[PDB]
């Protein structure tokens with residue numbers, strides 16, 4: 001495994017003995033899987049890769065002569081964004097076999113981001129790009145995003161994230177407190 005990320009996770013899983021440390025390994029693996037999808041997606045779309053940009057930072061980058069202090073800016077941190085010149089695409093990457101996390105984030109970003117951006121006068125769209133880690137299929141929320149990128153030519157393989165997390169869960173298959181933490 002010429003993969004230091006995998007080796008690092010494997011060493012943590014070899015060593016872990018308690019449920020609270022195992023829960024942090026689990027959450028880290030899920031985040032590493034999300035970050036892997038983000039890197040592959042941005043490279044495939046030839047857009048600059050970022051991971052968590054404070055909304056205040058996004059506004060400052062798009063509208064440099066803004067007085068943030070005039071507006072009520074929620075301090076959310078979407079994964080990335082595209083500024084087209086006329087429109088701001090707020091980008092969030094998901095890796096999930098389900099829709100639930102997309103709905104939670106769509107509702108949050110729609111109700112929190114869109115009002116202040118209409119105040120400032122920046123045309124904004126909420127974009128969520130989801131990879132199914134089992135099937136590799138990509139789902140997109142975002143009309144303008146879909147028009148810009150009618151296909152997403154990524155080659156994904158999530159198997160190693162599945163392998164690591166399955167080891168952790170097998171190691172703690174009889175630990176009720178761990179199972180409740182990841183439930």
Ligand SMILES: [Mn+2]
Pocket residue numbers: 051052077078079
């Ligand atoms: Mn994020």
Ligand SMILES: [Mn+2]
Pocket residue numbers: 034079092093094
């Ligand atoms: Mn995300």
